């Protein structure tokens, strides 16, 4: 469409300028046209929201740490909490926006199994970011939602994609992070990452090799950290 080209061009401009809120608006607008995204469009959408939500996650982490070190009956503590809650509501709004696009357009209209794994993984990621800042019954539901998406993504990728495929490696990576930081199960996080590494290294010829290698390096970085 005459507009879809306009929107992607703005998206690529916004990306080079590091205006990720503009990038996300353009890519969200492309998605709601209804047509399946190309690999290029898919990556622009992922890069945009990764950066949009990433800025709030880092802000939340800074504020919560300050909060955890502040005294109880200290006057200045309520302001800290209120600021954390403001940042929290932005993060939730961003995550629910992404999850909406996934459920309404992206997962459903995926034809490749590779495309479907990409989006199911994205679904797991954004419920995981919600689970990072959830508590109570809220936390239990978001965790199960994140797990459900990762587990389905995991199964498809094990049946349809090769161990060296970057999307399968990247899903193993983020699924292991889920086990380590959300479920707090480090041994299972280690096995998930190690298994993916070992299966990929046994086929380094049947290999895009750069992105596989760099993801496998993140897998092993985590493993070294976790086993130490």
């Amino acid at each position: 469409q005459g507009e879809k080209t306009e929107l992607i061009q703005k998206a690529k401009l916004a990306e080079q300028a590091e205006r990720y809120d503009d990038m996300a608006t353009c890519m969200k607008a492309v998605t709601e046209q209804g047509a399946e995204l190309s690999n290029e469009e898919r990556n622009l959408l992922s890069v945009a929201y990764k950066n949009v939500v990433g800025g709030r996650r880092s802000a939340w982490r800074v504020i919560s740490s300050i909060e955890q070190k502040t005294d109880t009956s200290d006057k200045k503590l309520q302001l800290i909490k209120d600021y954390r809650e403001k940042v929290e509501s932005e993060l939730r709004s961003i995550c629910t926006t992404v999850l909406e696009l996934l459920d309404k357009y992206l997962i459903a209209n995926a034809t490749n199994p590779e495309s479907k794994v990409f989006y199911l993984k994205m679904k797991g990621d954004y419920f995981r970011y919600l689970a990072e800042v959830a508590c109570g019954d809220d936390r239990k539901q978001t965790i199960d939602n994140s797990q459900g998406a990762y587990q389905e993504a995991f199964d498809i990728s094990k049946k349809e994609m090769q161990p060296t495929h970057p999307i399968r490696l990247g899903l193993a990576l983020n699924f292991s992070v889920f086990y380590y930081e959300i479920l707090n199960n480090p041994e299972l996080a280690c096995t998930l990452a190690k298994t993916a590494f070992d299966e990929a290294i046994a086929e380094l010829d049947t290999l895009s090799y750069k992105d596989s290698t760099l993801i496998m390096q993140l897998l092993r970085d985590n493993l070294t950290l976790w086993t130490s």
Binding site: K50, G54, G170, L173, V177, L214, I215, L218, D221, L225
Partner: peptide
């Protein structure tokens, strides 16, 4: 720290 895909 622990790294996810965004570290790439």
């Amino acid at each position: 720290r622990s790294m996810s895909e965004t570290g790439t």
